């Protein structure tokens with residue numbers, strides 16, 4: 001399925017080249033511009049654990065998830081991955097625990113040492 005495919009066929013987008021964050025572009029976005037550090041980014045996403053269980057979805061809330069890029073407001077894999085996206089892009093990210101919640105996990109849903117799968121749609125990004 002999709003998690004296996006990004007694991008085996010994804011692009012390492014880490015600066016360290018440690019395969020901690022792998023990406024596949026699923027729907028190509030607009031033009032060439034990607035968000036910059038500090039931009040307000042609007043996304044939709046769903047997340048799955050490696051046991052197949054969905055742990056979250058913004059779609060189910062009928063509102064986007066909003067954060068400021070590159071500020072550690074989200075897990076490292078998201079700051080790294082969303083920074084590579086074009087407006088309108090949909091991607092798959094595979095996030096090893098060192099770029100996610102590590103040994104701590106995130107109670108109640110995310111166990112220790114969890115590799116996470118996300119589908120992310122970059123809806124918009126704005127500075128100012």
Ligand SMILES: C[C@H](C[C@@H]1CC[C@@H](O)[C@H](O)[C@H]1O)[C@@H]1CC[C@@H](C)/C=C/CC/C=C/C(=O)[C@H](C)[C@@H]2CC[C@@H](C)[C@@](O)(O2)C(=O)C(=O)N2CCCC[C@H]2C(=O)O1
Pocket residue numbers: 045047055056057065066067072073074075076078106109110
């Ligand atoms: C929980 C996490 C905490 C954050 C991690 C980085 C670290 O440097 C920060 O100190 C720490 O606060 C952060 C919240 C997003 C920041 C921006 C939100 C904080 C407000 C408090 C409530 C947040 C939520 O309910 C999240 C939507 C919820 C929390 C539990 C997670 C397992 C999850 O369901 O989100 C989830 O899907 C997830 O894993 N997220 C949300 C989407 C972005 C990626 C990821 C995430 O980084 O969420």
